Design a protein around this ligand. Structure first.
Ligand SMILES: Nc1ncnc2c1ncn2[C@@H]1O[C@H](COP(=O)(O)OP(=O)(O)O)[C@@H](O)[C@H]1O
Ligand SMILES: Nc1ncnc2c1ncn2[C@@H]1O[C@H](COP(=O)(O)OP(=O)(O)O)[C@@H](O)[C@H]1O
Ligand SMILES: [Mg+2]
Lengths: 165, 165
């Protein structure tokens, strides 16, 4: 069921390593959860994994130099424009501000949440908790090598430089 | 004895596909042969394969968006400048001019060459004949696959954006 969500988090994580030398964040992975739940909610800010969840490999063409995705068709924005009442992953604009707290949802406890509130918070170490869930269920290293080879096949289609425009 | 030369031709072909989405030219391959005979001769324009021969994976950091390499430490120059008495791959600068001809050198005959003419010529389908040699010696697919893993390993650790500077 969460097969769409956990795949996004592995693929975004590999692509981000190819593109910026590092892997996805606590809050960037959190954005994939929020979007797995509310599929017509605009995700503003650090939103790379939501963008893989909604766009597949095609997010690769829309990622800004910041790792934020602009793709208004899939309601992904890097900053808040007028009238977008979306979730702001680590920013103060939009309708709903998502950041980190001691007493903030876990990976499990967030999937459960039935409402959307004016302020959303997620637990420290959200990525570590979410990688363990995926690890117990999948062979993640077999997936990562398959992810890298497909992302490279994408990038090599028109070449890195094409993909930058 | 020629392994190092034939590895550069297979590594550059995999790297150019990742950067510009297409293989290497007849003349880009020819430049590597030249780099192999004349270890101090400066090579000007169309030098992606001579760059791998002279720099290894460290060439990825010195590629212009044209796929020409600028590394003066290694006597590699994308355009001719005053006083660089080198071979010019498919330009009219420097001292020697390398260009395709109907009668030009073969891979075997260019290797066997002893002089340095004021004008070298390589046969049409220099790349075809050169890939037909290398394919008789190794399972090239096992190489391209390794070259990719190592090219990606290099790109990734920096981040594609660090590398494009
Ligand atoms: N640079 C491009 N190259 C090829 N096709 C494109 C390009 N830009 C847009 N399209 C196409 O135009 C249509 C509109 O897409 P668009 O709304 O521009 O995408 P996005 O919401 O990701 O910015 C789509 O069918 C898409 O496939
Ligand atoms: N990880 C890296 N390892 C080695 N060289 C790098 C790396 N990242 C970037 N470079 C760049 O590659 C180039 C290779 O050296 P070169 O231009 O020949 O001599 P110099 O050291 O004088 O700049 C340098 O311009 C350097 O800034
Ligand atoms: Mg060409």
């Amino acid at each position: 069921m969460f097969e769409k969500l956990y795949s996004a988090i592995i693929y975004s994580d590999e692509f981000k390593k190819i593109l910026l030398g590092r892997g996805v964040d606590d809050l960037e992975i959190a954005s994939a959860y929020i979007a797995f739940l509310y599929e017509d909610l605009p995700i503003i800010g650090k939103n790379l994994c939501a963008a893989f969840l909604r766009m597949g490999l095609d997010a690769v063409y829309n990622v800004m130099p910041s790792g934020k995705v602009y793709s208004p068709r899939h309601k992904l924005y890097p900053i808040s424009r007028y009238g977008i009442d979306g979730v702001c992953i680590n920013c103060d604009g939009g309708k709903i501000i998502l950041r980190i707290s001691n007493k903030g949802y876990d990976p499990e406890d967030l999937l459960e949440s039935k409402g959307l509130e004016s302020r959303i918070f997620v637990s420290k170490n959200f990525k570590k908790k979410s990688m363990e869930i995926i690890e117990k269920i999948w062979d993640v290293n077999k997936i990562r090598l398959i992810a890298r080879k497909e992302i490279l096949e994408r990038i090599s289609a028109g070449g890195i430089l094409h993909m930058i425009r």
